[PDB]
Structures are given as C-alpha cells and as structure tokens.
Amino acid sequence: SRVCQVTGKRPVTGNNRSHALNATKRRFLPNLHSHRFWVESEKRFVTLRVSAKGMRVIDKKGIDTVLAELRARGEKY
Amino acid sequence: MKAKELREKSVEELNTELLNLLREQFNLRMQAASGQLQQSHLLKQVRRDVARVKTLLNEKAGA
Amino acid sequence: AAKIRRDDEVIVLTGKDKGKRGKVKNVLSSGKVIVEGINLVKKHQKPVPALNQPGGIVEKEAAIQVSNVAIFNAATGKADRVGFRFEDGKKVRFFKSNSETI
C-alpha cells in the first residue's frame, strides 16, 4: 500500500491532458521511500515508508512526536 | 396449590421422568407398532407428560 | 361470545322452512350449525367397509348458517335476539325487549 505513513499521501487520479486536450486517465503516485530513523528516546533505529515531504515533517517536528501521533492514531510502525 | 402442576412441583421428579419414559413410552411404541386403539391418544398424552416433567427438571436444580 | 350455544331451542327465519323449531346439535367452526329436523337431506351412501356398510337413502341433517336461525323466546312464542350484559367472568344472555336472562 502506497501510503506516506506519517502524512498519508496516497496515489491520486487525474487525467493526462494532451495538446489536443485529450483526457487519458493516469495516476499521481507519491514519492515514497523506506528510511531508517534514529530515535534517541527508545535508543533504536526504526524503519518507515515515508514520502520526502513526510521526511520534511520529520525534520521539522521531531521523530518522537510524530511517532506518538502514529501511536495515538493506532497504526503500527 | 397455586398452580395446576402441584404433582410436578414436588421434589425428585427425575425418577418420575424415568418411569414415564423407560418401558412406558417404549412399550406404548411397541404395541403402537403392533396395532391397538387407546394407544392412539396415549402416546401423545405420555409425550406431553415427558415434556412437562423435563421442563420442570429444567426450571429448577432441586429435583 | 356466541349467541347460540350447544343446547338451546332455536327457530329459523330464512331458508326453506321458516316456522319449524328445533334444538341445535352442534356449532361448526365455520359458522354453519346443525339443528335437527330442519335441513333434512336423503343422500346416497356408497357401499364401503366398516362404517355404513350397505349404504342407503339415509336422511341426515345438513348445515344451516348461524344467521338464518334465531333463539326462540320461551315465554312468548316469537323469535328474539339476545345480548350480553355482565362484567365478571360469566356473561349472561338476556332476551332483548323481554329483559329476561337465559
């Protein structure tokens, strides 16, 4: 499943538009990446399937507060 | 004395159920297979009695 | 409640005979009573084993409807209607316009 796992970006649909304004339907799937994040509090590396914008959210908020938001959202890591 | 089941509101009716089934409903089925007349109403009567004493054994654990 | 019971002297109003009067034998579930000497019919009974072995032209009572036969007032020689007026478990039937219970 292509979910950002911190912000929930999902493959969204909207059609290709040509020069002759033709509408063939395509997908806008996210920039998901599997990255291992070091947590100081639990002293353990943790993997996460995260978009690049989600890693911007990581570097802005902090790893532990977004992990606490995941645990309050009731979703496994 | 309040209900019409005072003969089955007494204690230890499981042997009454056993006497009502064992050889009673059995021999009634035996001569019903052989073929008689008062048996025709008798087996519905004893089947209803067995049902009644079974629910009286089910409604209380004291008998 | 039932206006005519098992054993009451009743008189007919409509249907073939009018003035002949008899005692009701039984009330059918469908509302067609049997009252003797009223709806006679001689049928043709087949030769069958056990019950009615030879058959014949045996007369038996046919079924008269409940609405065609009324309860006869004993005191005055008329047909009368009856109604119920009591409050506890027994409802007495009383003669209408005679006000006498049965």
Partner: protein
C-alpha cells in the same frame, strides 16, 4: 454399569412381521427398526436392558425411503435404520 437410560429410547418399532424377518426369526435372529444415529453397541445394550435377552451380534443397515408419490406432488419417505440382533441360545423373543 449400563449406559444412561434416556439414550435407551433408540428402539423404535420391531417390524411388520414379513417373511424375511420371520424366516430369519425361526432360523436365528430378530429384526428391529431402530433410530437413525444408534450405534451397534446402543442397539445391543437397548435389547439387553429393555428386553431381557442377551444378544450375540448386531448387523446395522440403513434403508433409503421411497419416492412413492406421483408427479403432482413429489414426496419422499423418511430414512430409517434396521438392525438384525442375533440371539443364539435361549431366544425368548
């Protein structure tokens, strides 16, 4: 000792006394129409308790019910199981 007596209602009816049952009676065994779920051990214990006779062996057979009705209302007879219980010496039934 014996199995519980409320399960000793398996014996339904003996037979119609047709010539297979009666010829097999005068040779060795009685024929019983029994239950649908009665084990051979249950038929044997039921004979030895409800009748007074000991039984050597039981042969169990279930027989298909017939259709037996015409095309206006198709029916089926209920299935039943028949037991030949073997009573070799001192047969009183």
């Amino acid at each position: 000792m014996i199995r519980e007596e409320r399960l000793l209602k398996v014996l339904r009816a003996p037979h119609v006394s047709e010539k297979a049952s009666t010829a097999m009676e005068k040779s060795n065994t009685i024929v019983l129409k029994v239950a649908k779920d009665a084990t051979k051990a249950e038929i044997k214990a039921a004979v030895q308790k409800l009748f007074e006779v000991e039984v050597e062996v039981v042969n169990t057979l279930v027989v298909k019910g017939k259709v037996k009705r015409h095309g206006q209302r198709i029916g089926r007879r209920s299935d039943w199981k028949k037991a030949y219980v073997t009573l070799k010496e001192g047969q009183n039934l």
